[PDB]
Fold General transcription and DNA repair factor IIH helicase subunit XPB.
Amino acid sequence: PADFVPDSVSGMFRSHDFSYLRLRPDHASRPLWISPSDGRIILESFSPLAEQAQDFLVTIAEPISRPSHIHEYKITAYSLYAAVSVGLETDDIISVLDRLSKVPVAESIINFIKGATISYGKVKLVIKHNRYFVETTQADILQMLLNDSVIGPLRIDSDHQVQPPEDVLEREEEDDDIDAVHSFEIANESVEVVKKRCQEIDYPVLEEYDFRNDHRNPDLDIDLKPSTQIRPYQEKSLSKMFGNGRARSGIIVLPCGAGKTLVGITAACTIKKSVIVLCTSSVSVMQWRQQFLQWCTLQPENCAVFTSDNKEMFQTESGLVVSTYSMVANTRNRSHDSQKVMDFLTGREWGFIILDEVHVVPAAMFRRVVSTIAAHAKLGLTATLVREDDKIGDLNFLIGPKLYEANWMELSQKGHIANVQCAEVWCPMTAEFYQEYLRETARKRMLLYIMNPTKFQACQFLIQYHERRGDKIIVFSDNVYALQEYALKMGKPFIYGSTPQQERMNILQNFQYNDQINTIFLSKVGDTSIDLPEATCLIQISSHYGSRRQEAQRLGRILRAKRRNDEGFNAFFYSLVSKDTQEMYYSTKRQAFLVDQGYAFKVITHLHGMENIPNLAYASPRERRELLQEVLLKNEEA
DNA sequence: AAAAAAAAAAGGCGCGTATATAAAAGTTTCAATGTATCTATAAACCTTTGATGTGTGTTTGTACAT
């Protein structure tokens, strides 16, 4: 509602029917011919020079970049919406498609492309010279201010004001769209629904949140601080929040943890206003304050963070703020002095708000921040946008769709993010558990899946292989119930939820730079803390449907957060896939976007040498049939 | 009734009472010095007991097959 779904929907514009091709225009003109109606991308015989052409292709659709002449392409509806930042000559892309009119030129698609170039940069929501107003700016969304009632009748005929930009400032459209068809000064009351009304009245309107163009502020408790540096993937995001008129903001999809505070530093530094920051959990947040927050540009003293047990200095500093949603994303609240903090900052006209990895966060709890801050601008930072909660209003119509993707196979040609060759070992199955798996019921069937004799024979082989060629391991699995049994039946450490803080320390200290106790297991809450800077030998064993997304996201921090820049980087991933079992199809459906990312995958049902393992307990299958007798228990508890 | 041994008894040897003369040899007594031997005593440990952050725990809000 306030936000819009439009941030997780790539792979579109595929305009082609049972008779798509028109009289091949590019048939004669063969310098370049992408799939037009689709928006697909394909080179032409009068034109093979590719590498420099990365950017032009970046404007449209999805490639196949292990393609030879070129990679693939596609149309994208909101994709043109993103392109407005440059906002170049619209027909030029069509003019570029002029040669690329491969079939008879799909003017309809071209119009669709002209349409594909309709919204972004054609935004419409008024603003005024140190205030906000009820007008509109570009053709794509112009009326998204003027004809309105929360933007038009919620646009107030006030003439013009920077100093007069405050009383109203039908709430602060300080982040209004492109502005000023006759712009009626914006008010102070009711856009918390406008953001909902927007797509409700479906205005593809390009929000704009300025750098100094709202003098409801003698611009407030920030200031520019640029000390930072840049790896090859920054600047676009930074200038991505400028546009036309006055500045703006948006949403960006990233493998996070890359000093994303630093990019957060800039835009906040570049508005000098009131801003707050948010992260998941005192479980999660502390990987932020002090190894990647001070090599940067901020003074050492200001901010406060709040848990009323992990509390700070509140009622104290005029400067900026930082908190957690789930803290107040709920009627959860520890010390009523929280409501000594709650009321203002909630009610406070924050210039900007920072939300981070809201991906897992549900509307059923995510709407609180929507109902909490309503800051004049917002930060969009999560893991993945194609989702399971693909529901109606994603945070876009609040902030925007994804602004910057990542880049993996050919920009990382500046910085190698950990060359991957994924492995899935296709271990067959025995009916012995499986027979009563044919007798099972609700997901307590899946426990039987965990009862596979094959995992063991391979499990050590993985440990053996890794150390037979001598590189240490990081493993992935689930369902601790017996997976914990696996651990100290693997000769390897056990890790489990519902665990005291004390014991968490003994895991790493005489363990990291040592070279002997070189194996690890993972829980379902421990993954919410950290992964080692070591052992990119990545082995999946056990997972679970739906979690697949975050499970796949869970795999992310290992490699992408790594940045070392060697020649090859012979790194690999591995996984356990017990054959003839309920999940692998869903795992293939999980695999369905594995090499989507270009980070590839190779399969081995059996390698050269899996059986080389003589230390496996249950070497003969009667212990595996002893296992059957233990296999009963929990599934006889079940 | 007669023989033998000890006491009853005194007077005097011979130097204590002074007593100073002086030398000659030696003693003992007094006080500073040295040392193992009591003790308290406060500074060592060990255990106790009252105050204490907090690991685990009752409500909130959750992807997720079911």
The beta strands of chain A are 250-253, 275-277, 352-356, 378-382, 421-427, 473-476, 537-540, 573-578, 600-603. Residues 621-637 of chain A form the longest helix (17 residues). The radius of gyration of chain A is 27 Å. Chain A has 19 helices and nine strands.
